[PDB]
Amino acid sequence: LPYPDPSRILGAGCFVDDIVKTDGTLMIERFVSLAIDAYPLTKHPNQEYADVFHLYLQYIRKLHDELTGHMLDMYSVMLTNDNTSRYWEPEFYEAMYTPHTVL
Amino acid sequence: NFNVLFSTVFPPTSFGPLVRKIFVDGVPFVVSTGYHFRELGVVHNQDVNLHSSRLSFKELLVYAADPAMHAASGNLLLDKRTTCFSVAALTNNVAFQTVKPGN
Amino acid sequence: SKMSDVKCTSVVLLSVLQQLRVESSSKLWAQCVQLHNDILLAKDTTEAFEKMVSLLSVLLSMQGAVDINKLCEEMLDN
Amino acid sequence: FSSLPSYAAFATAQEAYEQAVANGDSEVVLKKLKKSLNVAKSEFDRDAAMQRKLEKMADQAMTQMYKQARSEDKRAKVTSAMQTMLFTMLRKLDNDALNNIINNARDGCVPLNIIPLTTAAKLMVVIPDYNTYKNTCDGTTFTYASALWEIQQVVDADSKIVQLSEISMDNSPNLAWPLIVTALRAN
Amino acid sequence: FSSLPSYAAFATAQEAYEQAVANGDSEVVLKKLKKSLNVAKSEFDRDAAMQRKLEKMADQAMTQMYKQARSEDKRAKVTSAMQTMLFTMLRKLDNDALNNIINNARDGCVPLNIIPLTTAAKLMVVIPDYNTYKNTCDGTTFTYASALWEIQQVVDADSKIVQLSEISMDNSPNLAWPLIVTALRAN
RNA sequence: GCGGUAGUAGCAUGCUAGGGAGCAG
RNA sequence: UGACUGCUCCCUAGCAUGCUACUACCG
């Protein structure tokens, strides 16, 4: 399995180009495409590397509770969490490093 | 391989497009009708017409892209910041471009 | 910890200084870009807290531009 | 669900075919009734799926709208926000040099150039009032940015070279107090 | 659907069957009550599933033909912008000093790198530091490329006018240094 | 009792296009 | 001001196939 440099994936969520990621709710697809690259760090013998993936799965959930909770206190809208929970579960990303290609 | 060695003896202002004056409906244009490569020697274009009337679309795209008319209507330039050969300055001011930090 | 809080305050300090049109004086923007690129490459929190005084003093010497009093009585350092 | 105009067909026919087994009847009547139930049942499981798709579709267009409107208030307020961010972050660092040149430049003692780090390092600040001079510097020694400088020249508004002996809560009300003090770093 | 040519049969078959429900209908006329709106309805649905396909096809040429128009209108706005260039970069050829090297040429071909070098009127010199300035552009006139040029203006990086007396050996630390000298040809 | 044919609604797959985003040399 | 390629996730519109119920004629 290939894995990146942790400082490259961590430093790609802290430094960006405005409206991009200076508000995470307006783009949660940036962090699902950065947790795909950080997945094979979960198998590393260093436990400070394996935490970079669990930090990205915990932020995608935070950015989803906010979004579905920011459109309920200003606009009386109620979003359904069906088929959204797959992005903070470590099985959508495990399927990208296993044969029998899909999509 | 021999031209590579023999081209270090000759003046550096003899290499590049070879221009000539043509007429397109009674007005003088300067266009490129060949090239002098340090490696491949002197090459001459095969379909050059000196007296034309109307320029099509495919004949305006080949006259706008050529450096023969942009570097024959601009000012002489002597740039001492670099040691590369310098041809012309296309305007009256030098542009200085910077790079911004991240967000 | 403390070396990562100085490296993120010098990214917000050259954005405040880039929105005030300090890019229009290429004798002082060439020093601010050198005090910001040098803090980011530092490896001690005693030689990066002293290029943050030179870089911050550029903003406090620009007079009217930034209302320091209002900005300090805005639920911040009093 | 309910409230749909096509709902008084999956209620009558649903109730009828239902009760119909207690009283009972020929198989013909049963088949007839079922071939009215299904005939006016598709009309319900078609108008309550189109709605089921419109009700979620509506809650998406009215979410892209919430994004195109918060991302235009996040961009029109850049200036006002990064200045607040910087000073929220400057308080948390709790430095000593950074918390001196900030308090000094709030009462008035701003610099006139960049604070140099060398050993000669000429400086020029503007003391606005006598108390700010008395607190900051005493004698030929000046404290600034948690460092010690030595005053080399004092200058009032135009070019009035003040001697250090004649600035003393006394001769002081008689000058133009925005001074321009020049100093050099120490060691 | 008010103009489909198969609405008449459907309408009549509905009337015959539906409207004649109250009237006593035997088990032999009921076939007409049933197998007359049937088949006609099938054909109508066939006459409506083809109309819906003709409509969409039609509304795929009244969109692909606005795009063929748009592009030709655009093709005529760029064809007239390159023309307005290649005729404005031509009225600028001092055709006394240019017809004097195309004529001394063996066949009329010349290198392009010697056209601005021998037939231009203005020179722009970009100078990094002061040492380079005194070996390239000293005084009000200087020689370069076997010619003589006379200085006309010295702007700097900021694009503010500098004078030939601000350029000292010791005032040099006080200028935005990429200096741009603009000179004109002499004689 | 079953098969075929033509519409209609509903669920997944693949492909072709458009849009936004992430990484690599 | 914003190059050339390759891979990949998410959303919408269209086309064909795959097990069903509904129609209706036909056996």
From Swiss-Prot, chain A:
| Activity regulation information from UniProt | Inhibited by Remdesivir antiviral drug (GS-5734) through non-obligate RNA chain termination.
Its quaternary structure? Interacts with nsp7 and nsp8 to form the replication-transcription complex (RTC): nsp12, nsp7, two subunits of nsp8, and up to two subunits of nsp13. Interacts with nsp9.
> Segment RdRp Thumb: which positions?
1-103
- Describe the reaction catalysed, as an equation: RNA(n) + a ribonucleoside 5'-triphosphate = RNA(n+1) + diphosphate; a 5'-end diphospho-ribonucleoside in mRNA + GTP + H(+) = a 5'-end (5'-triphosphoguanosine)-ribonucleoside in mRNA + diphosphate
What does the UniProt record say this protein does?
A: RNA-directed RNA polymerase that catalyzes the transcription of viral genomic and subgenomic RNAs. Acts in complex with nsp7 and nsp8 to transcribe both the minus and positive strands of genomic RNA. The kinase-like NiRAN domain of NSP12 attaches one or more nucleotides to the amino terminus of NSP9, forming a covalent RNA-protein intermediate that serves as transcription/replication primer.
Name the UniProt record assigns to this protein: RNA-directed RNA polymerase nsp12
Cofactor(s) of this protein: Mg(2+)
> What gene does the UniProt entry assign to this protein?
rep
- Tell me the part of the parent protein that is shown: 5221 to 5323 of 7096
Q: What is the effect of changing residue 33 to A?
A: Reduces RdRp inhibition by remdesivir
User: Please, which domain of life does this record's source organism belong to?
Assistant: Viruses
UniProtKB/Swiss-Prot annotation, chain C:
Localization, per the record, is: Host cytoplasm, Host perinuclear region; Host cytoplasm; Host endoplasmic reticulum
Q: Name the domain of life.
A: Viruses
Which residue numbers delimit the RdRp Nsp7 cofactor domain? Answer: 1-78
Q: What assembly does the database describe for this protein? A: Interacts with nsp8 and nsp12 to form the replication-transcription complex (RTC): nsp12, nsp7, two subunits of nsp8, and up to two subunits of nsp13. Eight copies of nsp7 and eight copies of nsp8 assemble to form a heterohexadecamer dsRNA-encircling ring structure.
Quote the function comment for this protein. Plays a role in viral RNA synthesis. Forms a hexadecamer with nsp8 (8 subunits of each) that may participate in viral replication by acting as a primase. Alternatively, may synthesize substantially longer products than oligonucleotide primers.
Identify this protein by name: Non-structural protein 7
Species name for this entry? Severe acute respiratory syndrome coronavirus 2
Biological classification of the source: Viruses, Riboviria, Orthornavirae, Pisuviricota, Pisoniviricetes
* Shown part of the complete sequence: 3860 to 3937 of 4405
Swiss-Prot record, chains D, E:
Annotated protein name in UniProt: Non-structural protein 8
Full-sequence portion shown in this chain: 3948 to 4134 of 7096
Residues covered by region (Disordered)? 1-73
Pinpoint the RdRp Nsp8 cofactor domain residues. 1-187
Task: List the taxonomic lineage.
Answer: Viruses, Riboviria, Orthornavirae, Pisuviricota, Pisoniviricetes
Native organism is: Severe acute respiratory syndrome coronavirus 2 (2019-nCoV)
Q: Where in the cell is it found?
A: Host cytoplasm, Host perinuclear region; Host cytoplasm; Host endoplasmic reticulum
Q: Describe the subunit structure.
A: Interacts with nsp7, nsp13 and nsp12 to form the replication-transcription complex (RTC): nsp12, nsp7, two subunits of nsp8, and up to two subunits of nsp13. Eight copies of nsp7 and eight copies of nsp8 assemble to form a heterohexadecamer dsRNA-encircling ring structure.
This chain's function reads:
Plays a role in viral RNA synthesis. Forms a hexadecamer with nsp7 (8 subunits of each) that may participate in viral replication by acting as a primase. Alternatively, may synthesize substantially longer products than oligonucleotide primers. Interacts with ribosome signal recognition particle RNA (SRP). Together with NSP9, suppress protein integration into the cell membrane, thereby disrupting host immune defenses.
Where does the record place its LRR repeats?
A: 30-57
